[PDB]
């Protein structure tokens, strides 16, 4: 539960760091954002579940 | 007092506040890269 | 060659670092008050 929480919360940080540097260069070079429109979508969708994971999961650790 | 669990992020949260300033800064990194058009 | 805009943003952060070290030194050095 705890490590499980620190995983979700900690991974959620690296995804953000990755997501943050990503989306930019994404819409940036139109070399796609059609193939990456796929990547970004998964990052975005993923992120939300994560927040919800850490959200609900918070009430069990603290 | 960052709830017991998040304590591991104390240090991280220590720098977050200053970020906004960075953006005003970046805008300059950019223009420089794009040769002040 | 090395792109100018990079020479700058690098030499730049480089100064905020040294000048920032000075500001830290103000709450620890001899110039402290403690």
């Amino acid at each position: 539960m705890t490590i499980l929480f620190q995983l979700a919360l900690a991974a959620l940080v690296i995804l953000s760091f990755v997501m943050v540097i990503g989306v930019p260069v994404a819409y940036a070079s139109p070399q796609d954002w059609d193939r990456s429109k796929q990547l970004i979508f998964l990052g975005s969708g993923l992120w939300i579940a994560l927040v919800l994971v850490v959200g609900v999961l918070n009430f069990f650790v603290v | 007092k960052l709830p017991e669990a998040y304590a591991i992020f104390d240090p991280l949260v220590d720098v977050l506040p200053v970020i906004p300033v960075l953006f005003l800064a970046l805008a300059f990194v950019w223009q420089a890269a794009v040769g002040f058009r | 060659r090395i792109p100018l805009w990079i020479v700058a943003t690098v030499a730049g952060m480089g100064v905020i670092v040294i000048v920032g070290l000075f500001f830290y030194g103000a709450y620890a050095g001899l110039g402290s008050s403690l």
Binding site: I21, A28, S29 | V15, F23, A25, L26 | M13
Partner: peptide, 28 residues
């Protein structure tokens, strides 16, 4: 102790997301 580790990365991040664009040359 030394969360300067943090700053550092999120710091070279700003210039990075434009540099990679200087490489993939486009939209600056």
């Amino acid at each position: 102790i030394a969360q300067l580790t943090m700053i550092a990365m999120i710091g070279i991040a700003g210039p990075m997301i434009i540099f990679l664009l200087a490489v993939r040359r486009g939209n600056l």
